[PDB]
């Protein structure tokens, strides 16, 4: 009767930046997923491939819990077949995504008077990320003919940009904490059933 540690993910004091999105593995435990949606405390709870209800009657080998913070008008990008700065350069989901995307407003926790600049997103990148790719490189982005030589300047940009969340921002500009559950069914006898 080992219960899956969802409290560590959803109730974490600090969430990671989207460019450095954190990944947690759920294995060898019981996950009663129904308490998650049958709580009505989130603003987005979509499941793809699998169905959110009667979802805890299935067995998987491993469950991945990806967590990060984006603003309100980028939550729609956390979905299969989406485009945008977050989907292209920060966090990409496969077209064949089977799993659940969970988000809720976190203006009370991640916004500060004068701006909370701890949360970052990747603004410049040559090519789109592959699905489930983490790019933490902070190399100066060359957008011109002259070499940057590691110094930001004309046509040489630092790849990461700060959200600067403020409590008086618009809802689309407000911070949202996102948890992505990936259901991976490897060959090993399924270790996360969760009656």
């Amino acid at each position, epitope marked *: 009767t080992n219960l899956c540690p969802f409290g560590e993910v959803f109730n974490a004091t*600090r969430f990671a930046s989207v460019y450095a999105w954190n990944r947690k593995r759920i294995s060898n435990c019981v996950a009663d997923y129904s308490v998650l949606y049958n709580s009505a405390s989130f603003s987005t709870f979509k499941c793809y491939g699998v169905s959110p209800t009667k979802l805890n009657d299935l067995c998987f080998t491993n469950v991945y819990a990806d967590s990060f913070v984006i603003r309100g008008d980028e939550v729609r990008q956390i979905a299969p077949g989406q485009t945008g700065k977050i989907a292209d350069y920060n966090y990409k989901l496969p077209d064949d995504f089977t799993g659940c995307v969970i988000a809720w407003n976190s203006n009370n926790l991640d916004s500060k008077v*004068g*701006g909370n*600049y*701890n949360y*970052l997103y990747r603004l410049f990148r040559k090519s789109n990320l592959k699905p489930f790719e983490r790019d933490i490189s*902070t190399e*100066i982005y060359q957008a011109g003919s002259t070499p940057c*030589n*590691g*110094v*930001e*300047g*004309f046509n040489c940009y*630092f790849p*990461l940009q*700060s959200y600067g969340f403020q409590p008086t921002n618009g809802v689309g500009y407000q911070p949202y904490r996102v948890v992505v559950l990936s259901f991976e069914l490897l060959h090993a006898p399924a270790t996360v059933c969760g009656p």
Partner: antibody, heavy 120, light 109 residues
């Protein structure tokens, strides 16, 4: 608005100690290299210490090694400088300097500075 | 070894609209790791040139710099009233980021 507020200066008896603090706001302080630069009254600029954004690459002026130590908090966005065994030679305004990413020494943005005066 | 940066001249008196050139000689080769700062009294310095030819953000075109190795020159093509201040040169080829001892540009009158 990018801000840099130094504080914690003032008078110290020669041979005592201080700790200076820098309050950053308006930018991703965790992605920047940080430095301390002094300027004695009526004199030139002298670089004091350097800190990497990760924090392990640490350098000091040769005249303040073993006495000064630099630290930074990427969560609370604060830079510190602990000063020990202070001399009257250390009397200067200590600026909190903000370096162009990964030049390690081209200081974008400076604080207003705080005046450290060491005298009996 | 402390890389000593010696600036030239000690003082410079020019009228507004005049061309100004400042010198900074290094004891040993710094290659291209040298920048120029400007400081007005009662204020923190201001980055103007870096890597001996690149201008900082918001720096007008009349400021320019060149040089490599052990000799470098900062040029103000036409002096505006707000360009009269003290200028320091700084190297990043060797810890410690030593500075020059300043070239002060006063208004000729």
């Amino acid at each position: 608005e990018v801000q840099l507020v130094e504080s914690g200066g003032g008078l110290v008896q020669p041979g005592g100690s201080l700790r200076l603090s820098c309050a950053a706001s308006g930018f991703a302080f965790s992605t920047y290299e940080m430095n301390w630069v002094r300027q004695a009254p009526g004199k030139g600029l002298e670089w004091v210490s350097y800190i990497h954004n990760s924090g392990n690459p640490v350098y000091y002026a040769d005249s303040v090694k073993g006495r000064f130590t630099i630290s930074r908090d990427n969560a609370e966005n604060s830079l510190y400088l602990q000063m020990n065994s202070l001399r009257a030679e250390d009397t200067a305004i200590y600026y909190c300097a903000r370096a162009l990413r990964y030049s390690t020494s081209w200081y974008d943005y400076w604080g207003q500075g705080t005046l450290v005066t060491v005298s009996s | 070894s402390e890389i000593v940066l010696t600036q030239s001249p000690v003082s410079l008196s020019l009228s507004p609209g005049e061309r100004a050139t400042l010198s900074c000689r290094a004891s040993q080769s710094v290659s291209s790791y040298l920048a120029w700062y400007q400081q007005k009294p009662g204020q923190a310095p201001r980055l103007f040139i870096y890597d001996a030819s690149k201008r900082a953000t918001g720096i007008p075109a009349r400021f320019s710099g060149s040089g490599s190795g052990t000799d470098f020159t900062l040029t103000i093509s036409s002096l505006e009233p707000e360009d009269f201040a003290v200028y320091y040169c700084q190297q990043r080829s060797n810890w410690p980021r030593t500075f020059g001892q300043g070239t002060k540009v006063e208004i000729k009158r």
